[model samples]
Target chain A: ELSEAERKAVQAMWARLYANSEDVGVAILVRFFVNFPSAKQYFSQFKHMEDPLEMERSPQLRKHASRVMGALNTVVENLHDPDKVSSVLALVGKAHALKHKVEPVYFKILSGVILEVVAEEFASDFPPETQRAWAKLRGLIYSHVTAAYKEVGW
Target chain B: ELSEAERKAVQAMWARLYANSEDVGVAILVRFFVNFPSAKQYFSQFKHMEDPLEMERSPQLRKHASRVMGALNTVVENLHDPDKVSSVLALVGKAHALKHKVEPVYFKILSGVILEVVAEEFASDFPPETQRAWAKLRGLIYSHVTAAYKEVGW
Candidate 1:
C-alpha cells in the first residue's frame, strides 16, 4: 500500500518513462541480453545474430522490447487496482511459463535493471522516495507473477 | 491514398479487429504459416512446433501476432497522414527485411490471409468496398515496406 505522496510520485515517474518507452525499453532489454547472454538462447530467431549492435537494431528485438514496455505500462496503469495488477501479472506469468521459459531470476534481474534505468534516465528528478515507490511496485509484480507460475504448476 | 469513405470503412473494421486483437491476429498469422509452410522457416523459434493450431495456442504466437496488429493499428490511425503512415510502414518493412527475412511475397500472402479473416469475422458486415478499402491500405503498406527492403537490398 502506497501513501498518497508515493502514489503520486510513482504515477509521475511512469508518465515520463512511458513517454520515452521505446528507447528506455530497448535499452533495458539490450542490457539484459548483455548481462545474461544465456537468455538469448530462448530466442532462436535472434540467438544467431552475433553482433549486440545488430541485435539492438533487429526488428525482433524492437518488437519484443516494445511489447515488454507495453506490458509494464499496463502494470503501471493498474497499480491503483490490486485485482487488475495481479490479473495482468498472472497472465504474464502464465505466458512466461508456457512459452518463454523465463525463470523467476530474470524478473528479479529486470526489476534491478529497471531501477537503474529509471535512476539514470531521471537523474535529478528521481528521488529516494520515488525509487522506493518503484521498488515496492516491482516487488508486488514479482510476487503475483511468481505465484501465478506456481498456480500453473510450473 | 484511400478515399474518405474507404478510410472510414477501414477504421470501423479495425475497431472490431483491435477489440479481439490477440485472437484475430494469431488466427491470421497461423493461417499464413499454414497456408505457406515455407514461411515457417523464417520463424526459427516456432519452426519445430509444426502445428499451426498448436502455434495459435502458444503464448509467443499471441505476443508476436498482437504486435503485428498493433503495427496495423498504428497504420490505420495515421491513414489521413501519408507521411506518418509511410514512415511507420518503412520501419516495419526494414524490420521484416533485416530480422524476419520477410519478402514482398509474404506480405501478399498475408494480405490474402487478413482479408479472409476479416471476411470470416465480419460476415454480413463485410461488404465488397470494405474489402477493397482494406486491400488498398494493405497495398500502401506493402509498397512502403517493400521499398524499404529494396533500400536495404534484402
Candidate 2:
C-alpha cells in the first residue's frame, strides 16, 4: 500500500502522462517491441515490425497503444480503492492469462518500460522520490495482478 | 557462473534424487499442484484436481511427473557443459512459450518447490551450502530458460 502522499504523487504524474496518452502509449510500445520483440510474437501485425516509423504507421500498434493508455488511466483513477484496485488488476490478469496467454513477467517488463518513458517525458518531475512511488505502486500492482493469475488458474 | 565446487554439490544432490526419480518427481508435482493449482490449468485431466490423494492415483499426474524427472535429470547431467546447459534451458523456455504457454515465473515457483523437496528428502545432505548451490544453478537455469522466452517471443 502506498502512503496518501505517494498515491497523490503517482496519480499526479499519471495525469500528465494520461493527457498525452496517445503519444505516451505509442512511444512505450515502440520502445517495448523495439527492445523486447519476443513480446510481439503473438501480434501477427507486429511480427516483423522492426522500424519505429513502421510502428508509428501501423493501425494495430496504435489501437493497442490506445488500449494501454485507457487501462493505465483507469488504474491511476482507482488507486484509492484497495478492493477495486485488486479486482481491476485481477480482471487484467485473467484477460492476459486466459485471453492472451501472456507471460506474467511481461508486467514487470512493461512496468520498467513505462517508468523509463515517464522519466523521459517528465524529466524534471520524475525525481528519485517520484520514481520510487511508481515503482512501489507497480510492485503492488504486479502482486495483485499475479494473484489473479493464480485465482483463474490460467 | 557457479564455482566448480558449487556445481559439484548441485550435481551430487541431484544424483541422489535421480536415483529415485519416480518418487521424487511425483512428490514434487504433488507439492507444486497442492500449492499452485494455476500451473495445472492447461491440462484438462487435472483441471478439477483438488485432492493430493487423488493426484497420487492419477496416471496423468504420474506421467507428467515422470516427464519432469527426465527433464531435470537431463539438466543436471549437462551442468558441466555451459553451452549445453543454456541450450537445454532455452529449449524448455521455447516449449513453454510456444507449446505449453506456461508462465515464466512458474520456473521459479517450481524451483522453490524442488528445493523444499530436496531438503526434505535429503535433510542432512541439503545444508545451507548445498541449498545455495541448487538455488544458484536453478537461478541460472531460469535466466536461460526465460532467455529462450524472449528468443521465441511468446
Candidate 3:
C-alpha cells in the first residue's frame, strides 16, 4: 500500500494520470459497448460503478492497485519515447477496432477526465503553475494519442 | 530562438499543457469571439485569418506572444493548484459573462484545437494510452470550463 506521505507525493500526478486513463479507457470501453454490445461481456466484472475511493476499499482492487499504478508510471516514464508510446496506442487502437467501436466520443471523454482530475487535485495549485503544467501535460499527451486514426469504413 | 534541446524540453512539457490548454482556451476564445464580436475585436491583432500559420507567426502575435506564452506557462506551472486554476478559469468565465455567450459548439472548437495541436506536435509518440488520455482530457476540461459560468453583472 502507498503510505500517506507517498500518496500525497504522488496524488496530483496520479490523479491527473488516473483521470486521463479512466476517461479514455472508459470512453473507449463505453464506445465499444455502444457500437458493439458484445464488448460489454468483457467488462461485466466492472459493471457496477465505484467511486475511486470505493475502488480502493476492495481487496480485489488493493491486490491489483500496484499493477494499476504501474500502468500510469509506465506511460509517464516512457512518454518521450515515440516507439514505445506508439506501441501502447497501437494496442488500444487495434483492440477498439476489433470491437468495431467508435472513439470520437471517447475523445471527448478523454478531455473531460483530465480537467476533472486536474481541477479536483490541483485547484489549490492552479495559480502556482504546477496546475497549468498538469493541463499542459494532458494536452500534449492526449493530442499525440488521438491523431492516429484510420477512418471507419463501416 | 530556442536551441534544439530547449525546444525538446519545451515540447515535452508543452505537449501535455498544450493539449488541454488549447482544448479549453480555444473553445472559450472562439465562442466568446462569436458571441461578443466586441470582445473579439480586442484580440483581433492576434487572429490572422489569411495564412493559418499567420496566427502563430504573425508579427502582431509576436508582440503579444510572450504574454500569451507566459499565460500558458502560468497554466502549466500551476495545473495542480485548483484555486489558482479556478481563478484563471473564473476570469475566462467572467469574460464570457460579459459577452453573454454559451454555445455548445464552443466545446467542439475547444476539443478540436486540443486534438489538432496534439496530432500536429507529437504524432510519433502516440500510443493507445495517449489517445485515451486526449479523449478524456478534452471531455473533462471542456465541460468544467464551460460550467464556469455565473451571473457577472455587465
Q: Who wins the TM-score comparison? A: 2
For model 2 the local lDDT of residue A48 reads: 79
Tens-place lDDT per residue, model 3, A28-136, is 3333222222223334344352233343343443433344345545655565465775676555455554563545334334444434434444556544344334434
Q: Per-residue lDDT for B126-147 in model 3, tens only?
A: 5544444444444444555556
Q: Is the docking of candidate 1 incorrect, acceptable, medium or high quality?
A: incorrect
Q: After superposition, how far is residue A111 of candidate 1 from its true place, in Å?
A: 1.3
lDDT of 1 by residue, B1-154 (tens): 6899999999998997798887889988886664445567777577666455688877766778988899999989988898999999889888888877765666755665676578668877865578668767766776788789899976
Q: Any runs in candidate 1 off by more than 4 Å, and if so which? A: B1-154
List the candidates ranked by TM-score, beginning with the highest. Answer: 2, 1, 3
Q: Write the per-residue lDDT of candidate 1 for residues A47-76, one digit (tens) a residue.
A: 866455777798888888899989888877
Model 2: lDDT of residue A140: 82
- The sequence of per-residue lDDT tens digits that candidate 2 reaches over residues A42-154 is 68788877666789879899998998788777888888888888778888888989988898877766675676578668978876567667868877878988888888885
The total number of steric clashes, by the backbone 3 Å criterion, in model 2 comes to 1
The lDDT of each candidate is 0.76, 0.78, 0.45
lDDT of 1: 0.76
Query: Positional deviation of A127 in candidate 2, in angstroms?
Result: 2.1
lDDT of 3 at B97: 51
Report lDDT (Cα) of residue B111, candidate 1.
64
Give me the runs in candidate 3 sitting further than 4 Å from their true place. A1-154, B1-48, B53-69, B99-104, B150-154
Residue B90's lDDT within candidate 3 is 61
Residue A34 of model 3, lDDT score: 25
